[PDB]
């Protein structure tokens, strides 16, 4: 519904900075209407080869800060949108991510339990996603 070029151009130029996350987060906060749109693009974007680990790590923090804020604006479409693709993206990047980043992300996944963003239905999906990568054979 919105200019996907912006979200993409920004995500591709996303850097690891406290101000950067907020800079983009603020823009996404005004995309409450593009709940499914942003989730679809973000997901398909995070599940792409071009996107590296760094880009992914940052994206997670961006969507995380945005969604968490949604609760303050009485928004649920964001949780269901980013949540339905969270178990997939997170589980896809968690397996591709190194043992080092695994901890950085693992600690982030728990944060969701504190803010109570997604429900047990979604959380149960994320865990299962990792369980699959846990086995090599």
Swiss-Prot record:
MF annotations from Gene Ontology: DNA binding; RNA polymerase II C-terminal domain phosphoserine binding; RNA polymerase II complex binding
Stretches assigned to the CID domain: 1-130
Claim: DNA-binding is one of the keywords in the record: yes
Name of the protein described by the UniProt record: Regulator of Ty1 transposition protein 103
Family as reported in the entry's similarity comment: Belongs to the UPF0400 (RTT103) family.
Residues of the whole record sequence present: 2 to 131 of 409
Protein's organism: Saccharomyces cerevisiae (strain ATCC 204508 / S288c) (Baker's yeast)
Transmembrane segments: none
Keyword Transcription regulation attributed: yes
GO biological process, one term: transposable element silencing
Subunit: Interacts with PCF11, RAI1, RAT1, RPO21 and RBP2.
Entry function: Involved in transcription termination by RNA polymerase II and in regulation of Ty1 transposition.
Domain of life: Eukaryota
Misc remark: Present with 3930 molecules/cell in log phase SD medium.
Entry GO CC: chromatin; nucleus; site of double-strand break
């Amino acid at each position: 519904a919105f200019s996907s070029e912006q979200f993409t151009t920004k995500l591709n130029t996303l850097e690891d900075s406290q101000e950067s996350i907020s800079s983009a987060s603020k823009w996404l906060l005004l995309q409450y209407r593009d709940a499914p749109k942003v989730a679809e693009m973000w997901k398909e974007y995070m599940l792409r080869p071009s996107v590296n680990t760094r880009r992914k790590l940052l994206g997670l923090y961006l969507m995380n800060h945005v969604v968490q804020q949604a609760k303050g604006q009485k928004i649920i479409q964001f949780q269901d949108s980013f949540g339905k693709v969270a178990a997939e993206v997170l589980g896809r990047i968690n397996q591709e991510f190194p043992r080092d980043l695994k901890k950085k992300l693992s600690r982030v996944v728990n944060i969701l339990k504190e803010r109570n963003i997604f429900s047990k239905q979604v959380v149960n999906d994320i865990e299962r996603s990792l369980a699959a990568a846990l086995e090599h054979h």
